[PDB]
Amino acid sequence: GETTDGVYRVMTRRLLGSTQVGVGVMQEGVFHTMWHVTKGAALRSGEGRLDPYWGDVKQDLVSYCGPWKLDAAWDGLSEVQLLAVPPGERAKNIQTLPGIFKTKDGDIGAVALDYPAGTSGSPILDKCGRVIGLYGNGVVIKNGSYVSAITQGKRE
């Protein structure tokens, strides 16, 4: 149905009313979101249908209609913007400087902004407007607060 480039809300009618379970990015005719949002289930865009194409539970990513297209990366220095799309609230750009997730396989960016679980899949942007990853998969620190990773896929 609607395949215009932009940020989108992922909704469901299975629960009470209309519940927002996540967010995604439409870029180059492919819808990108986090695996824990849809669980690999088919999405609907008005009358049109979006079927999964690629997915991975460890990476926590999933693409619809085609392969993963987002391939920009955080430069390890600059401030970034989380285009937060919270449930029931308007889309909003929040600027921050990312921290680091030090792992056994390497270092990853991390945004320390706390948002509802329905905000999962909201894109993180560089000064050019490029999508450097998605917000929604991270950890809970001693402060109770949420620190999410900057989760990016791979473009073949």
Partner: protein, 39 residues
């Protein structure tokens, strides 16, 4: 059945609210895609 609704454009906005700290955390990632803290 899940559905999608447009929420906006993907653009950088000058003069946006600047908030949030930059922490260096020691983390682990399991086979289920779940992060956990290592201390």
């Amino acid at each position: 059945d899940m559905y999608i609704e447009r929420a906006g454009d993907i653009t950088w906005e000058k003069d946006a609210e600047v908030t949030g700290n930059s922490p260096r955390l020691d983390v682990a990632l399991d086979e289920s895609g779940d992060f956990s803290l290592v201390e």
